[PDB]
Write an enzyme that holds these catalytic residues in place. Structure first.
Site, short mmCIF file in Angstrom:
data_model
loop_
_atom_site.label_atom_id
_atom_site.label_comp_id
_atom_site.label_asym_id
_atom_site.label_seq_id
_atom_site.Cartn_x
_atom_site.Cartn_y
_atom_site.Cartn_z
CG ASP A 462 -1.93 0.99 1.11
OD1 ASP A 462 -2.03 1.59 0.06
OD2 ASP A 462 -2.66 1.18 2.06
CE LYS A 529 3.79 -12.62 21.05
NZ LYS A 529 4.82 -12.37 22.11
NE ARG A 530 -2.59 -5.20 21.88
CZ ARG A 530 -2.44 -5.66 23.12
NH1 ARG A 530 -1.78 -6.79 23.36
NH2 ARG A 530 -2.97 -4.98 24.15
CE1 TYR A 531 -4.84 -4.99 14.50
CE2 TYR A 531 -2.69 -4.44 13.60
CZ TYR A 531 -3.89 -4.05 14.16
OH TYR A 531 -4.13 -2.72 14.37
NE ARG A 532 -5.50 -12.21 17.63
CZ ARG A 532 -5.93 -11.43 18.61
NH1 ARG A 532 -5.95 -11.87 19.86
NH2 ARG A 532 -6.33 -10.21 18.34
CB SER A 550 -6.20 6.79 4.17
OG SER A 550 -7.18 6.01 4.83
N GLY A 551 -2.97 7.30 3.98
CA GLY A 551 -1.90 7.85 3.16
C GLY A 551 -1.07 8.90 3.88
#
Ligand SMILES: CC(=O)N[C@@H]1[C@@H](O)[C@H](O)[C@@H](CO)O[C@H]1O
Ligand SMILES: CC(=O)N[C@@H]1[C@@H](O)[C@H](O)[C@@H](CO)O[C@H]1O
Ligand SMILES: CC(=O)N[C@@H]1[C@@H](O)[C@H](O)[C@@H](CO)O[C@H]1O
Lengths: 596, 8
Positions: A462, A529-532, A550-551
Site C-alpha cells: 500500500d 500478536k494483536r492481529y490474528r 489514510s496515506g
C-alpha cells in the site's frame, strides 16, 4: 551567476590547484564543485590532437577574479563549478562508461552476471569507489565476467585508458542506493589505531565525522577534543581506514572521540552544512577580506555570498563598551578547513552556507516556534499535504507527504475508484481545512503511480506516488521530508509523530485544524500478536499506545532530521490495537527507480 | 591484495 553550460574547445589558462582524471568533463565539473578551492576547470577529451596520457585530464583551477583567460584548443572542455549556483547539486553519477578502464587499487575480484550487478557490489561494499567490469565479449576468457573493485586516495582513478569490451562506473552510495549499514553510534573517550590517510582541524566531533563522510577514503575517525592533553593535537580530526574496513581496536582514552563515515546515509544527514556558530573560537586561514558587520549572522552571510570564502571569524564590538560594528574576516584554506583552531581570543566562527546547497533539502533545520501538544501550527510539518477530491463535491480524501519538488508519497488504497488524476487536488502548508477556499491555490496531479503488485491495504503494497503538474517553491511552510536510508534499517526511532486530519473513512468524521500526536513505534512481532486475522509483513510497521488519515505520514525524528518511516495504511481501529503502516525503507529502491 | 589489472 551560474554558467552551468560547458565550453567547447576551450582551455582556461593557469591557476591550477591539482589534476585528477575523470570520465567526462561533466564529472570534472562535479569534482570541481566539491573541492574546497575549485572555481573552474579545463577537461581534455579523447582525441588525435592530444596524446593518450592527457585524455580524461581534469584540471581544477582557482582565480582571485573568479575567472581566467580563455584560449581555444581542440579537445578542451572547460567549465565553472556549481558553488556559484542556487540550484541543488548531487554527487551521484549513474554513468556506465563503455570501453573505458578506470585504474585504481584493485582489492577484490569476482564474477558478475552483468555491469549492473557488478555496480551493486561496488555500491554495497565498504571500500568501493568505482568498478571496472569485463563483458563476455571480452576476449581473454578467464577474465570474462570479472567485476573488479577499486579505490583511490581521492575517489577518482589514478589513470583512465581505453580498453574495449570493458565497462567502468562509480559507486552509487551517493545516489542513496547502498544497502551498507551506517553506524551513527559515536564512541566518546575512545581512539582508533589504524591507517591515518589524512587529517583536518575540526571544531567538534560532529564536523569531524561529517568531514570523514564526504572524504572518499575515510571509513572511520578519531577526534582529539580541545581538552586533549598534548597541545599540538587539539581539534585535530584524524581520518582513518583499514583492510577489514573496521577499527582494528578500541583503545580507551579521555577527550578523544571516534566514529564512522556516514557515506551510506549521506542523503538524510547534513554533510556539507555546518550551521552552528563557534564562540570565543577563531578559525585560522588565509585572509580574503575584512569588513564591517553588525553581527556574526551577517558575517556568515557575507561569507556565503563570497564564493572563495570557506569560513570566517567575526570579531564583535569589543566587550560591549564599543559601537556595535564588528569586524568580519572572510577566510579560506587549501582544504575547506581551518589550519589552526584557537579558543579564547573571543571571535565567533562558523562556515560558509554556500555548501548547504549540496545537502538534501530535507536536512535543513526547522524553526523552533512553539511546541504545543493540543494543536499543530504554521510551518510545523512542512511536508504534510492534504489530498483533495473534486467528486462528488470537493473534500479531504487523503493525507500525503512531500518527498520531492514534483512528488507526493501516499497510500495506494486512497485511489480506490479514482478514475483519473484529473480529479485530484494537492494543497500544501495548510493548517485548517476551513482555510481552503475556491480561490485557494493547489497542485494538479499529473500522474498516479501505484505499486505493480498492489491489491489490498491488508495485503502489503500500500504505497503510491503523485507526480505534480507543477513543482513546489520550498518555504518554511512547505518543504520535503527525507526517506529513510537503507543503511538505517536497524535504527531505533524513539520519537515519532502521526499528523493528519483524522480521515480513516467518511465515518469517522473529519478534522479542521491539523492534528499532531507523538506515537511510540511497536515491534512487528508484538504487532503480529494483536492481529490474528491478518499477516504482518517485513514491509509493514506498526505503532500506537491516532489522529492520522489514510496515506498520511509517520514522521520519525532522528539526530535532528525528520524521516518518513511509514505511511498510514490500515489500522483497525482506534482501540488497544496499533495502526499498521507501510514500511517506507522497504520501498526505497522502488521510489528511487520511479522518481530517479 | 594480489588483484591484477585487465590485460591490455
Ligand atoms: C568559428 C569560431 O568559433 N571562431 C572563434 C572566434 O570567434 C574567436 O574570436 C577565436 C579567438 O579569438 O576563436 C575561434
Ligand atoms: C560481499 C562481496 O563483496 N562479495 C564477494 C565475496 O563472495 C567474496 O568472498 C570476495 C572475495 O574476497 O569478493 C566479493
Ligand atoms: C470557522 C471555524 O471553524 N473557525 C476556526 C477557528 O476556530 C480557528 O481559531 C481558526 C484558526 O486558523 O480557524 C478557523
Amino acid at each position: 551567476e551560474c554558467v552551468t553550460q560547458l565550453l567547447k574547445d576551450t582551455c582556461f589558462e593557469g591557476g591550477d590547484i591539482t589534476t585528477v582524471f575523470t570520465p567526462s568533463a561533466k564529472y570534472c565539473q562535479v569534482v570541481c564543485t566539491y573541492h574546497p578551492r575549485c572555481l573552474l576547470f579545463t577537461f581534455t577529451a579523447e582525441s588525435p590532437s592530444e596524446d593518450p596520457t592527457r585524455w580524461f585530464t581534469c584540471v581544477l583551477k582557482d582565480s582571485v577574479t573568479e575567472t581566467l583567460p580563455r584560449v581555444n584548443r581542440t579537445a578542451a572542455i572547460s567549465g565553472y563549478s556549481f558553488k556559484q549556483c542556487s540550484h541543488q547539486i548531487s554527487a551521484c553519477n549513474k554513468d556506465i562508461y563503455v570501453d573505458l578502464d578506470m585504474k585504481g587499487i584493485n582489492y577484490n575480484s569476482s564474477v558478475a552476471k552483468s555491469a549492473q550487478e557488478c555496480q551493486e557490489r561496488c555500491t554495497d561494499d565498504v571500500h568501493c569507489h568505482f568498478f571496472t567490469y569485463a563483458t563476455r565479449q571480452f576476449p581473454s576468457l578467464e577474465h570474462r565476467n570479472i567485476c573488479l573493485l577499486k579505490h583511490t586516495q581521492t575517489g577518482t582513478p589514478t589513470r583512465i585508458t581505453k580498453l574495449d569490451k570493458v565497462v567502468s562506473g562509480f559507486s552509487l552510495k551517493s545516489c542513496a542506493l547502498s544497502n551498507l549499514a551506517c553506524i551513527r553510534d559515536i564512541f566518546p573517550n575512545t581512539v582508533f589505531a589504524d591507517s591515518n590517510i589524512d587529517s583536518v582541524m575540526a571544531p567538534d566531533a560532529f564536523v569531524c565525522g561529517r568531514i570523514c563522510t564526504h572524504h572518499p577514503g575515510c571509513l572511520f575517525f578519531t577526534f582529539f577534543s580541545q581538552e586533549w592533553p598534548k597541545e599540538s593535537q587539539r581539534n585535530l580530526c584524524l581520518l582513518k581506514t583499514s583492510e577489514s574496513g573496521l577499527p582494528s581496536t578500541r583503545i580507551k582514552k579521555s577527550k578523544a572521540l571516534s566514529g564512522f563515515s556516514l557515506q551510506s546515509c549521506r542523503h538524510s544527514i547534513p554533510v556539507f552544512c555546518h550551521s552552528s556558530f563557534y564562540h570565543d573560537t577563531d578559525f585560522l586561514g588565509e585572509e580574503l577580506d575584512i569588513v564591517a558587520a553588525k553581527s556574526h549572522e551577517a558575517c556568515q552571510k557575507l561569507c556565503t555570498n563570497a564564493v572563495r570564502c570557506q569560513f570566517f571569524t567575526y570579531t564583535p564590538a569589543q566587550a560591549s563598551c564599543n559601537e556595535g560594528k564588528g569586524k568580519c574576516y572572510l577566510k579560506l584554506s587549501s582544504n575547506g578547513s581551518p589550519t589552526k583552531i584557537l579558543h579564547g581570543r573571543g571571535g565567533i566562527s562558523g562556515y560558509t552556507l554556500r555548501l548547504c546547497k549540496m545537502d538534501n533539502e530535507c536536512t535543513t533545520k526547522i524553526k523552533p516556534r512553539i511546541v504545543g501538544g493540543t494543536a499543530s501550527v504554521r510551518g510545523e510539518w512542512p511536508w504534510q499535504v492534504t489530498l483533495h477530491t473534486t467528486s462528488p463535491t470537493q473534500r479531504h480524501l487523503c493525507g500525503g507527504s512531500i518527498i520531492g519538488n514534483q512528488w507526493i508519497l501516499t497510500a495506494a488504497h486512497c485511489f480506490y475508484g479514482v478514475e483519473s488524476p484529473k480529479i485530484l487536488r494537492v494543497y500544501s502548508g495548510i493548517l485548517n481545512q476551513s482555510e481552503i477556499k475556491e480561490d485557494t491555490s493547489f497542485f494538479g496531479v499529473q500522474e498516479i503511480i501505484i505499486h505493480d503488485q498492489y491489491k489490498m491495504a491488508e495485503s502489503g503494497y500500500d504505497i503510491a506516488l503523485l507526480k505534480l503538474e507543477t513543482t513546489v517553491n520550498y518555504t518554511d511552510s512547505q518543504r520535503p521530508i527525507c526517506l529513510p536510508s537503507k543503511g538505517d534499517r536497524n535504527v531505533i526511532y524513539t520519537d515519532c509523530w502521526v499528523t493528519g486530519w483524522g480521515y480513516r473513512k467518511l465515518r469517522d468524521k473529519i478534522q479542521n485544524t491539523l492534528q499532531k500526536a507523538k506515537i511510540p513505534l511497536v515491534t512487528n512481532e508484538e504487532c503480529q500478536k494483536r492481529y490474528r486475522g491478518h499477516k504482518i509483513t517485513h514491509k509493514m510497521i506498526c505503532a500506537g499506545y491516532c489522529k492520522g488519515d489514510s496515506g498520511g505520514p509517520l514522521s520519525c525524528k532522528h539526530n535532528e532530521v525528520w524521516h518518513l518511516v511509514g505511511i498510514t495504511s490500515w489500522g483497525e481501529g482506534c482501540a488497544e490495537r496499533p495502526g499498521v503502516y507501510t514500511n517506507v525503507v522497504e520501498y526505497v529502491d522502488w521510489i528511487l527507480e520511479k522518481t530517479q | 591484495n594480489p588483484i591484477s589489472d585487465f590485460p591490455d
